[PDB]
Amino acid sequence: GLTEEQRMMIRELMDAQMKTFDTTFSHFKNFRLPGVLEAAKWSQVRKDLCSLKVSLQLRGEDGSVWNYKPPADGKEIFSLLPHMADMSTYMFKGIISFAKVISYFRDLPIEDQISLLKGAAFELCQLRFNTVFNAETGTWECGRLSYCLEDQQLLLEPMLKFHYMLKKLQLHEEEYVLMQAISLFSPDRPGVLQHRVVDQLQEQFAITLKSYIECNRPQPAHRFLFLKIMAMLTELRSINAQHTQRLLRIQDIHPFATPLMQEVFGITSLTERHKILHRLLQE
Amino acid sequence: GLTEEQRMMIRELMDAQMKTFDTTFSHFKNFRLPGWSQVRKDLCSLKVSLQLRGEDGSVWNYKPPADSGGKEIFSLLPHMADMSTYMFKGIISFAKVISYFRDLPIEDQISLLKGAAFELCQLRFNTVFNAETGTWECGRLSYCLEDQLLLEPMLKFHYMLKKLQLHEEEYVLMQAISLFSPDRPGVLQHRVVDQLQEQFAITLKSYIECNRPQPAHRFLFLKIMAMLTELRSINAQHTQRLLRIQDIHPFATPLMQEVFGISLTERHKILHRLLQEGS
């Protein structure tokens, strides 16, 4: 099997996930919704928003259903940004709480904790979003909220191909939370000082995930599952880089980022430029 | 053809309709949206889904809830009250610009508008009704009948009236006939209103003979007048059901309360103010 230290490592990550992942989105409230009613910069922004166009569905407690179809391309392209801003911030807060519960993360310097959270916030959210993704319907089922993709041409978008590829691997709850740990403890994040320590921590999470697949799955059929998982994490880091650059382009012509997102994406001393992230980590 | 008085009559009614019917509902804003046994049958009869199209091209759609423990039956009721009040305000302005209605006593103006508010509103709602889709296309707003439904008299009324394929002039004459009803409760000048009603009916009969020679339009004037009698029956039924819902759950706006009864100018203060304001 696995070393008891490896079994305890999974225990802490799973415990962190249970305490910090609102799988039913029950506590996601008070979010903004779309209301009822330089050229090269905008030209790039329109292509950034057209790729991920979704319809919104709100199921009520009484049984009624509200549905929102997105408009066609104008400034209407930023109709869902405040809602997505609230959803990202809500998810980022749960990721921050996830890292705080992990003991290996708490023992790191505060400047390294901010650097790791800044580089892995988007990735750990996509990893959590994949657990509520329905590939048959192309819908992220977030409790009462649902995000369905409007439209082969989808698989061209890397973030859509990522969710379909990751969902097809059919990972366990432990394998997902190990991907989060591996992604969180990335030593090559910008601003990280303790490179050697974070690299050794990442290797331990990777070894445990590699050992978990060997011990808990049929040996010949899942012979390369661990390597497929690492390839998805590499692709997710490429998508994280591309998403950050899109967001900074959208933010440039049309500010929409919340104060917490501004700290994560570098929008205007790590501790003095990331005071919200610093305060959330000190609580 | 038509006498010059009849031609001026249709001209004033059509000009009245154009100035007071917001067919696109573009000036309908600030309205509410969704967040005993016999009363539950009243609301189940008219179950509709709401669609709100935005200027940008987006669509908000609301599918209604299913009956399960009550209270949820009155989700769209707040909105239907805001839509009704907006429609009646245009109905009030419609009557206010007709010369024959201005020259009546203000106590009779309240009485006539109190008895024909629902009828004139349904006649206007029928003009934006799509029988093939079962939807009232109210500009950016759309009200689709959520899926033998003709058992409801108000729904059969809209389908039967749409089949007659009436012109704009025939609709606005029906509004005049319904508005100048002498037997409305509270009307004092019975003979003045009854004489006014007969002139509108004669003009409608004359218009039909001068402009509809086809065999499908045979007995059209008598079918129209029969539809107006049916609409008066539906008006009483709707008033009875509304008061039951208001009894167990008050939902009528202050203007609706005046019309449905929930010294005429003393109880009808807003109606009194609107009739005195300029059009």
Numbering used by the authors:
A (entry chain A): 142 to 178, 195 to 230, 233 to 310, 316 to 432, 445 to 459
B (entry chain B): 142 to 176, 199 to 310, 317 to 431, 445 to 461
Copy out sentences from the published article reporting this entry, exactly as the authors wrote them.
PXR is a nuclear receptor that can be activated by diverse compounds to elevate metabolism, negatively impacting drug efficacy and safety.
L428V was chosen because (1) it is potently activated by the three ligands, (2) it is a conservative mutation in which the WT residue (Leu) is biochemically similar to the mutated residue (Val), and (3) L428 shifts away from SRC-1 in the antagonist-bound WT PXR LBD structures. The mutation did not alter the overall protein fold, including the position of α12, as compared to WT PXR LBD. The L428V mutation results in increased hydrophobicity, reduced amino acid sidechain size, and reduced rotameric freedom. Accordingly, the M425-V428-F429 contact surface was slightly compacted compared to the M425-L428-F429 surface. The residues M425, L428, and F429 form a hydrophobic “hot spot” that contacts agonists through moieties such as the 4-methoxy group, and mutations may change the nature of the hot spot due to a combination of factors, including hydrophobicity, orientation, and size.
